[PDB]
Symmetry: D2
Subunit: 452 residues, 4 copies
């Protein structure tokens, strides 16, 4: 199996795309932009409906970090289909979910007292995390960061501030969320070159929260929780300065406010550590996780400081959570991660770092490259000084990449996210990076961007 | 397999129950009322970790309608595991999510243009129904029923109204929900015997909404929707009057207000019909479903009039939506309902109708029996005139039923829900009712309730 | 002065009514129901711009309790105009605001520690009661009564529940208000004759709050207050059962919930007692007042248990609060109430009780008469059994009353409020009732209502 | 009458301050900081209870712009006491309120179609302005600026973001308000010297709204209204760059969003023009006004684009609004303003400008002076580079000023506002400025601030 795409969209793929519009809601699908109709997968390759074969650099939106069809994960589901699928894990008990909870507690950030709530997705996780914070603190408000994307349900909508379309005629969602600039070292309201000047940018963010919220309109003692992603994912895959969460805890702790680390995307080994937050050297009180945890099965988890746990029964619960198939799959994923995959993403870090700083130098359309492990984001600006978003160009590059057999996804207004399965070999990476470049190169020539 | 219980909880179950309290959040588990620790299942029975075997009348909180381990479903899954698990349905198209989506619209109540938004759970369904209701109507408010349960996320909790604990310390949740008395024929504020006088109670519930909301504090034309359960799942299995939803649509259409019907529990032919609402001869604008459709797999589904689809991309989306594994399970589950299982639930309806009216005639502790198909709800009262809840007694029956090999669920303050798998045989249905009557009989004697 | 009307509206009034529609916002003026253009006043009568003279039974919407132009009040003002008008009471202290504040606590219902927050109006009073309730209890929610009116600011409108138009296009207003049926003896959802069966109706209204809010969707211990009018001013002058507020305090104390009584209309001895609540033998934690206390001057006053005072400075404040001109008028107004005017309203109560029961016996259009002191409310019904509002007819009576020299106010959908100044003589009280009966009689004949 | 204070607080003033604490709510009073107990006034002098005489530089918190006891204003109230005090100006009509409305429309900013709503205070005005905006646009959200102070009621609380104490345990207030930095040329999150670099600062504010709200979490088409004060008053009396509202309209108009100019403090001639906004060369759609409009009587007005008016009756109204005494007083104030006072504040502008830039040069404790007409704010910083607030020093200066006979008020965290009556002579000003300096001088020596 090598990349091989004779034509796309194919007659079969064209018929699915017609049908999908007949019977399915307008979500985030894009007929022209993302005409990829998957029928099966193998290793790091999607096999489409018309037979075209594409190297994967999307990993099912980060859902698959172990691979697109992990053997150990399908054996674990098969083995768990034999005993029990569902055991109402919130009314009755079952050991599988307890085995997962104990494992999740174990691998949590830091070395502190933890408990675990189970969910079916990242939005449910972050909904959980909200209630848990509301209950334990008896405070009702929350800080999130502009660019953050925590979900699409009425709690997480409030928290999510990536695209105003997300909240189109949704107002009002859950009250008490206030937003401040994320320390985005490429776009922040201060013009600050956050790579050259990280402490200057860290300070401006903190100084905003302290001086322009707490001192004016936000009672600091009324804030349950600060919600952050350790790398904004949907927000264009943004890496904030190394010493940012350390400075943020300092300010959190000074007003007895919870830190909530949304690792729905950047967790499960993606950045060459179990959790994204470790690189930033802080122990979050609540850690939410989903996507990659279920290795292709729907699963969500909320990991928290044990003393934050719900006083009484019937505050929160869910029928679906605690499903055995998902828990069987999860334990297996975490085993795959600990036994090779997490080391592999640290191994391929310097390869994506060199090859993308190569592309930075050469293609003037690229404004910024950034990432950790196998979590990368290239943002494409029309003009480097102006930093205007090349949204149209980004779409063209993805389409071009798809034509050449590379599967990519667009995060943010003007960037593309490289997130292959953590199983990818050195020879499968160089292939993706080679294809990716050739996509930029074509679209660069097409529009008269310099090529140094 | 037969029912076969020695010590429950046995020594392995006691160890699991301990481990659960240590690692896992405080939810709706009860070591003292629901001490059932499930290792595996076959046919209609649970096998616990000590090897005790119990007849199922809980059906995993109405999720295993097709059986606790259906052969058709597990084969449909394992076939799909050979192809692909997750395929980024929100961003990329696959045929499986389309087939399921297409299938769902076809089986939907009435005969009108429908589309479908795939979700991960009941709450993730009703959350979606909210946003569809909001976006389509460009109205922000909803009506809901006291006694209703629609999920535990910041949207749905405004909608939910079963127990205050559910909303404890959560305010504010989503604004704009106003609630009103569900036409419970047994408990309503007007005292009305709703079984005897079903029109009088319908008028009252309607009179309230028109005269007390619409004429005083709730602008009719600013209401985006009315969420109702056709039978309240966590409300004690309250069955409304047959002409209720008819009267409620007369009112709804008069002000352009969408009627949303929640079938997360009573759906998938639980009541002897594919959709619970069908018994009531009305067509809802939205239908939400989860639980049973997945058939042991987490699944979500919001079915709506094509008119209400979001005009633009990026209003609502989800990473796990349209799971191919889940879609494969769902289609298999649907076939079984149409090819035997729905018929079997019409067939066994009279048995329960008989045996549970035999039980009310005999045991004074039983205030009201009610149900359709294989959805039954016995409510237990201290006195038949004052109707004080027999909460302590209801919990004892559940514990007694369990020491005699019957998995039962509480539902409401003082009632028990009988919801066996729709694959249950006549002989297995009698066996479980026998054991159910015995558990009432024990707890009746113990407390000196009358036995006629 | 006598009543004396020729053309109303006369040619100067028509010119003013035109100028008003041109320069001024669309509020609660009605050229077609309230075409009364006031130039000056003396004693108990209005003189209009054409020199038509009308007997007053409106009392400036219950503001001129002491008369339309009281000598004592105007002297108290002009004496204060010689000293100072505004003195920055919020920031600087003056003796006048303290004297009035001290005076207000002394006259307050019951005998407990009280303080006072001076405001500018009824809404600015109840807004204050909210913040005092919130700050003191550290609870965010309130209960209120369907039919209630408490003002038209973003706090109070949640509290208010008289007409939807009041809340049209305003959502969201302040969250956390839940409403319930006021124990109207004439119109309630249970049908109960509350005059006949006042306990049955009290139980119902109480049963609703306990069983339908506190037991299902409203955590009792998260309710900061219950706002009630002792008689609903814009609700058609509905007089609740005498033992109602007693039962409601039993419940309120059981959950630590402040009972707030609004006397913005029924206060200042309107009902023959200084405070309207007094008739009901309970002591409210907060008492709000405005209108009549000012005596032709804008004034606001929130009276509360000393326990609930804000711990810190800068939570609540207002620039115009504690106006010295207004305080001088208020003290003068209070003296009159205690030195003649409250007595005069007890004295004239039987007259209205007679004449309006004589009118109900005679005119079939009259569904219900009700009132205390000099607060009377006739409600007009199409039919006495169906109780459909006689809205069109009620408006005609007001117009007929006015062509015969009687200023009257609508109140509720189909009723009229009789609220003359408390300086009204027995002879002036008979005259206005005679004219009132005549206006009913005309509109009865015109529409073929029965005359017994 | 000259400044003359032998001792303060006096034995009489000490007794009032004791009593005030017995019977009055904790608001913004400060026993130690503002021990000024007014008994009467004359010209520009307060006469305290113990006989001490103080030149006024507070003007009753900006309430008196015509003087502390204007003759023309007391003659107008006296003349209006004779005819009518209250005439329920929202139910019935009266020419006085129409005469005021017509006058207010006339003197409004720009030359456009206007209507007028009447209120009792600035909070009611801004509550009005909210509803009017909500109704006309059918949008529910609003932008205000950090530092803004629009009121203390549940709508205006949301809008007000000056001190977090203001919102202490108040959450939730009205949803949908979002806040952005005010272009404060001395403190903004960008460090921008707004006097040297106004366009750079204007852009950063606009660029924040456009790029960090509209493009991320705030749908621009869902924003009814941008609320601004043309000089932040309570926020330390801050003058934003001359071309700021012009750039803000540009952005407003591009998304069909209303501009709401809160002139409650800076209006009624205070800045040497009728309205503060004129200096900034834009025509606001809604203009709110109170305080100075009533010349010592409680009055509020909301002036708006006529096509924004309430479609239907009963959306908004108030019992108090339209009071004749206040309207009589208002017309008189506006006459005083147009016939000398507004020219006088333009005359004394260069005198406060020179004498305060004198004080800037000499006293290192002064960080910034700023203002227009007779609206001035001196902010005192501990260190000029650091800009730390000298809150304690500010209190000392006010107390010191009070001791020497000068009446001042503290606006913001570390500044004092000079706002004498517009009637003040050149010789009464130099006196105030002389006293003010001597207060700074003393406190400067006391603490070892340089004196150049
Ligand atoms: C922080 C965060 N929260 C929630 C989710 C997904 O919530 P679910 O509960 O699984 O529905 C994601 C996935 N990030 C995706 C989200 C795409 C979308 O929701 O449209 C991304 O890569 O943008 C996420 O990164
Ligand atoms: C109407 C409705 N909505 C939502 C849900 C659950 O949403 P999920 O997304 O599947 O979690 C249920 C299940 N009713 C269960 C609820 C159990 C609980 O949450 O405590 C019941 O029958 O008690 C339901 O009946
Ligand atoms: C309980 C209550 N609160 C507040 C108010 C009015 O607050 P203000 O601040 O004095 O405006 C009223 C007056 N009831 C009037 C209301 C008129 C109206 O606003 O339309 C009435 O009798 O209709 C009232 O009864
Ligand atoms: C913008 C604005 N809104 C409202 C008000 C006052 O609202 P009322 O309706 O009159 O109560 C003021 C007065 N500015 C004063 C406010 C002081 C205070 O409210 O504590 C000031 O100078 O700080 C104001 O400047």
């Amino acid at each position: 199996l090598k990349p091989n795409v004779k034509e796309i969209p194919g007659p079969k793929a064209r018929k699915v795309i017609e049908e999908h519009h007949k019977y399915m809601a307008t979500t985030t699908n894009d007929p022209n932009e993302y005409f990829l109709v998957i029928e099966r997968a193998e290793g790091v390759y999607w096999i489409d409906v018309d037979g075209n074969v594409l190297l994967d650099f999307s990993s099912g939106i980060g859902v698959m970090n172990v691979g697109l069809r992990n053997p150990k994960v399908i054996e674990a589901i098969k083995k768990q289909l034999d005993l029990v699928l569902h055991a109402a894990g919130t009314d009755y008990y079952n050991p599988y979910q307890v085995e997962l909870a104990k494992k999740l507690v174990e691998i949590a950030p830091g070395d502190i007292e933890r408990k675990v709530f189970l969910s079916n997705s990242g939005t449910e996780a972050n909904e959980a995390a909200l209630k848990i914070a509301k209950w334990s603190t008896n405070r009702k408000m929350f800080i999130a960061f502009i660019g953050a994307f925590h979900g699409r349900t009425h709690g997480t909508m409030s928290l999510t501030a990536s695209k105003p379309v997300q909240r189109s005629r949704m107002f009002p969602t859950m009250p008490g969320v206030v937003h401040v600039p994320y320390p985005n070292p490429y776009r922040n309201p201060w013009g600050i070159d956050g790579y050259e000047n990280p402490d200057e940018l860290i300070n401006r963010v903190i100084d905003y929260i302290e001086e322009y919220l707490f001192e004016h309109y936000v009672p600091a003692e009324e804030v349950a929780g600060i919600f952050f992603e350790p790398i904004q994912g949907e927000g264009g895959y943004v890496v904030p300065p190394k010493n940012f969460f350390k400075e943020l805890k300092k300010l959190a702790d000074k007003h007895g406010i919870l830190l909530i680390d949304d690792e729905v995307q950047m967790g499960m080994g993606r950045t060459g550590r179990m959790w994204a937050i470790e690189h930033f050297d802080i122990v979050p009180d609540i850690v939410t996780v989903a996507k990659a945890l279920g290795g292709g099965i729907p699963i969500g988890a909320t990991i928290f400081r044990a003393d934050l746990d719900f006083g009484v029964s019937g505050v929160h619960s869910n029928t679906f959570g605690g499903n055995t198939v998902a828990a069987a799959a999860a334990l297996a994923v975490i085993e795959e991660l600990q036994n090779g995959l997490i080391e592999n993403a640290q191994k391929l870090e310097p390869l994506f770092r060199e090859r993308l700083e190569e592309m930075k130098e050469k293609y003037e359309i690229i404004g910024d490259v950034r990432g950790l492990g196998l979590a990368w984001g290239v943002e494409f600006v029309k003009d480097r000084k102006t930093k205007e978003y090349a949204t149209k160009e980004r779409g063209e590059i993805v389409v071009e990449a798809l034509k050449r057999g590379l599967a990519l996804l667009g995060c943010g207004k003007s960037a593309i996210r490289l997130i292959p399965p953590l199983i990818i070999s050195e020879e499968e990476a160089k292939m993706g990076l080679d294809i990716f470049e050739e996509a930029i190169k074509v679209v660069s020539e097409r529009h008269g961007y310099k090529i140094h």
